[model samples]
Target: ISSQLGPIHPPPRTSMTEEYRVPDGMVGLIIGRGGEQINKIQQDSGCKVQISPDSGGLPERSVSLTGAPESVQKAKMMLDDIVSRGRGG
Candidate 1:
């Protein structure tokens, strides 16, 4: 394969972003000790999970996830399970 003078390539692209809301006051469980759980989410789902800062007026914590579309979805599902289990499921 050859081009006029160089190989063709696509420009840089942005990753997807999603917001996953967790049960109220359960952000700590998702984060785990020293962010261990958070790290696992990233590793397993290939998504970046950012725990939003609490302002004392929300029913649940807003966790921002960024990555490929499927990765975000996977991460969300995993978080959902974690939240449910933490709530005695």
Candidate 2:
């Protein structure tokens, strides 16, 4: 039972636990030259990437991604390969 406008949407989440942080440096490295790299991945795998600041003073060089377990694993592998192969890694 719905109209052309759209169906009813669900409410936003009120509370969440375990927040992950994204390393700023990794953000750039993951995205790559024209974003085509990550973009292609998302388009193909239906996974999303997010970056948050490290709050525990752990060198803010950590990235956290959320999605299907498989997708997350893939993103991690790609990130590791790129970052490690880069200057400092």
Candidate 3:
């Protein structure tokens, strides 16, 4: 696309501030009681996963993982899959 400025595209937008949100009930399954499981996962994956504070409100647990795009994406996908299988219990 083109514009008066020669191009319609603006600056690139990246996941500079990306985060993942799991249903409130799911955080326990993912993070495990006392953050046992999620902490292990983070260590093994060499990435970081954080649960949002109570400020996120109910029914939602926001997780923020920061790292290279590939690593962050892969970790999130794995976590999602685990939760989706209904095996997160």
Q: List per-prediction Cα lDDT, in the order shown.
A: 0.61, 0.48, 0.55
Q: Please report the candidate that would top lDDT against the real structure.
A: 1
What is the C-alpha lDDT profile of model 1 across 1-89, one tens digit per residue?
Answer: 10011132331112344455567457777777757877787778777666766623445776666666677667767677776686554
Clashing pairs in 2: 22-52, 23-62
Show where candidate 3 strays beyond 4 Å: 1-17, 55-59, 82-89
Winner on TM-score between 1 and 2 is 1
TM-scores of the models, in the given order?
0.56, 0.48, 0.58
Clashing pairs in 1: none
For residues 1-89, what per-residue lDDT tens digits would candidate 3 score against the true structure? 10011122332112422355467666767766767777777666655666675525334666666554566656566567755664343
Please say which candidate is ahead in lDDT: 1 or 2: 1
So what's the TM-score on candidate 2? 0.48
Candidate 3 C-alpha error for residue 20, in Å:
1.7
Cα lDDT for residue 18, candidate 2 = 15
lDDT of 2 by residue, 49-75 (tens): 444444454454444444555665565
Clashes of each: 0, 2, 0
Q: Over 4 Å off in model 2, which ranges?
A: 1-27, 51-62, 87-89
